[PDB]
Amino acid sequence: DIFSTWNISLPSVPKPPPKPPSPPAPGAPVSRVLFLTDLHWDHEYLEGTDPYCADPLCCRRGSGWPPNSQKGAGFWGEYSKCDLPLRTLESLLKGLGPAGPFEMVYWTGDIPAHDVWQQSRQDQLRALTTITDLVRKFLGPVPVYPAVGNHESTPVNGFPPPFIKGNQSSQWLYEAMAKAWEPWLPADALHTLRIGGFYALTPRPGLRLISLNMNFCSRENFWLLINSTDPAGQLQWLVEELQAAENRGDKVHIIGHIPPGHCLKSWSWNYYKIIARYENTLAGQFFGHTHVDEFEIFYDEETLSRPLAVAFLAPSATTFINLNPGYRVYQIDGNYPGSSHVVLDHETYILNLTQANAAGGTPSWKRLYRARETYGLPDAMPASWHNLVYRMRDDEQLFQTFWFLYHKGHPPSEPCGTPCRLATLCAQLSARADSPALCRHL
Numbered sequence: 001d002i003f004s005t006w007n008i009s010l011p012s013v014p015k016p017p018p019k020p021p022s023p024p025a026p027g028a029p030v031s032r033v034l035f036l037t038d039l040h041w042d043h044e045y046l047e048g049t050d051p052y053c054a055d056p057l058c059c060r061r062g063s064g065w066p067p068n069s070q071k072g073a074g075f076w077g078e079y080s081k082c083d084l085p086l087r088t089l090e091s092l093l094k095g096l097g098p099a100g101p102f103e104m105v106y107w108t109g110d111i112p113a114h115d116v117w118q119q120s121r122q123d124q125l126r127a128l129t130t131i132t133d134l135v136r137k138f139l140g141p142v143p144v145y146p147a148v149g150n151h152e153s154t155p156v157n158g159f160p161p162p163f164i165k166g167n168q169s170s171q172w173l174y175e176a177m178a179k180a181w182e183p184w185l186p187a188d189a190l191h192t193l194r195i196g197g198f199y200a201l202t203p204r205p206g207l208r209l210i211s212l213n214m215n216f217c218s219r220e221n222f223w224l225l226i227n228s229t230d231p232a233g234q235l236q237w238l239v240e241e242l243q244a245a246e247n248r249g250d251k252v253h254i255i256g257h258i259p260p261g262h263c264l265k266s267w268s269w270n271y272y273k274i275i276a277r278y279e280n281t282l283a284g285q286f287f288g289h290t291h292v293d294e295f296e297i298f299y300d301e302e303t304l305s306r307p308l309a310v311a312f313l314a315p316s317a318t319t320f321i322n323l324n325p326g327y328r329v330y331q332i333d334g335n336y337p338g339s340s341h342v343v344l345d346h347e348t349y350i351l352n353l354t355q356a357n358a359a360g361g362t363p364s365w366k367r368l369y370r371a372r373e374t375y376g377l378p379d380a381m382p383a384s385w386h387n388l389v390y391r392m393r394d395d396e397q398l399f400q401t402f403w404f405l406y407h408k409g410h411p412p413s414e415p416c417g418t419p420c421r422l423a424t425l426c427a428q429l430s431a432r433a434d435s436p437a438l439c440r441h442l
């Protein structure tokens with residue numbers, strides 16, 4: 001009973017009848033949006049060190065060395081509890097050309113490495129500014145719209161709400177974020193950013209981007225043990241933004257770090273009803289944090305029967321843990337008046353480390369897969385990802401395809417049996433935390 005239950009009131013405006021978007025006309029323009037998340041840069045990464053140490057994070061000087069030099073940390077990363085060297089990140093931005101030009105970029109937190117015990121505020125800012133300047137160097141004019149992750153501050157997950165004031169607050173972090181991201185965000189967005197770490201703006205006509213600070217929903221944010229009731233009034237603020245976009249007829253993309261399924265109950269539950277209320281206004285939801293390729297389907301609140309939205313959970317750039325580095329690109333309905341702004345398809349690129357770390361190897365980022373093609377989907381709409389889940393329940397060969405891509409082409413040695421399957425398939429339907437009914441049909 002540590003966390004209380006609370007409610008958020010929706011405006012008196014009646015909900016318009018549900019009208020799921022219609023597919024775009026033949027040959028309509030399509031925009032490409034890059035999605036980066038969980039870069040996790042370890043400035044202490046050292047090739048050849050022991051990648052299987054006893055500490056939380058290995059592949060460092062303090063991690064020691066292995067007796068067999070063959071078993072030492074690789075040049076571009078390692079398949080272990082290790083984060084990325086600056087090389088692989090800078091190499092990621094270098095090879096973006098083949099991933100087509102981008103209209104926008106979404107960047108969703110987890111920038112520092114997992115060296116929690118020895119991390120200072122100065123170290124965190126050094127990561128923020130270093131990798132921000134690098135991303136802006138390679139993308140140039142293309143704007144990047146970032147979001148706050150759970151590793152940005154110190155201690156990890158410590159994001160006090162606004163009512164906690166003074167030096168103990170996270171104003172040292174939001175202030176630096178406003179300075180670092182000023183080239184990318186307008187003034188009104190920076191104003192909100194400096195306060196609660198979230199903001200809203202219009203990247204293009206008819207679209208409204210909302211970047212949420214999901215640390216106010218995290219079970220790990222120890223600060224929320226004081227008061228977990230809509231910290232920073234973010235959910236209430238979200239309702240006002242969504243309702244205002246409904247009035248203007250705009251569409252909304254929401255971005256964040258922790259997907260709403262991994263949130264505290266009340267936050268996740270209140271979030272669930274806001275989605276359902278503004279299903280016509282929402283055009284996309286993009287999160288990260290999980291480091292793995294996934295998605296979460298939303299249903300109508302009362303009966304949990306009609307799927308009405310999907311949140312795409314892109315995979316990490318980092319290897320943590322035993323993963324190939326990869327990134328994501330979304331194909332979205334283009335920039336024209338009659339656009340729905342929805343996700344039409346998406347692609348995933350990786351860097352096969354076994355080939356990049358091999359003697360004489362070279363890092364070449366390649367497309368791992370394209371969703372619709374490999375899952376045989378007529379589109380990327382909620383109903384279509386709903387069918388895919390219950391399809392993977394019936395046959396095994398298709399789930400193994402999903403399970404393989406899950407791990408960015410590098411799944412573990414132990415196979416995923418029938419108890420692992422239901423757990424995985426059930427998570428794809430659990431966009432609302434602590435809701436066992438959502439998996440009744442599994």
Ligand SMILES: *[C@@H]1O[C@H](CO[C@@H]2O[C@@H](C)[C@@H](O)[C@@H](O)[C@@H]2O)[C@@H](O[C@@H]2O[C@H](CO)[C@@H](O)[C@H](O)[C@H]2NC(C)=O)[C@H](O)[C@H]1NC(C)=O
Pocket residue numbers: 004163226227228229230231232233234236
């Ligand atoms: C936690 O605080 C809420 C109200 O304030 C919250 O924090 C603000 C800084 C801002 O983020 C708001 O959006 C938040 O809601 C308390 O809610 C009160 O609840 C009583 C009855 O329980 C109600 O009569 C009051 O009107 C509420 N206050 C407001 C401002 O609406 C809540 O009680 C606090 N939690 C605990 C355990 O005390």
Ligand SMILES: *[C@@H]1O[C@H](CO)[C@@H](O[C@@H]2O[C@H](CO)[C@@H](O)[C@H](O)[C@H]2NC(C)=O)[C@H](O)[C@H]1NC(C)=O
Pocket residue numbers: 119120121122154167168
């Ligand atoms: C605000 O709080 C932070 C967190 O404790 C302080 O950070 C430390 O500051 C001292 C200098 O007084 C340094 O020696 C430590 O290395 C800092 N630690 C970390 C983790 O950053 C900071 O000093 C405080 N600021 C003020 C003005 O009191």
Ligand SMILES: *[C@@H]1O[C@H](CO)[C@@H](O[C@@H]2O[C@H](CO)[C@@H](O)[C@H](O)[C@H]2NC(C)=O)[C@H](O)[C@H]1NC(C)=O
Pocket residue numbers: 352354355408409410
């Ligand atoms: C990453 O690269 C490795 C090495 O090229 C791939 O492993 C090889 O896979 C082929 C068939 O796919 C086998 O015949 C070789 O014996 C494998 N070599 C080694 C050293 O294991 C691996 O499939 C690649 N993975 C991805 C996702 O591209």
Ligand SMILES: [Zn+2]
Pocket residue numbers: 038040110289291
């Ligand atoms: Zn992470």
Ligand SMILES: [Zn+2]
Pocket residue numbers: 110149150151257289290
């Ligand atoms: Zn995270």
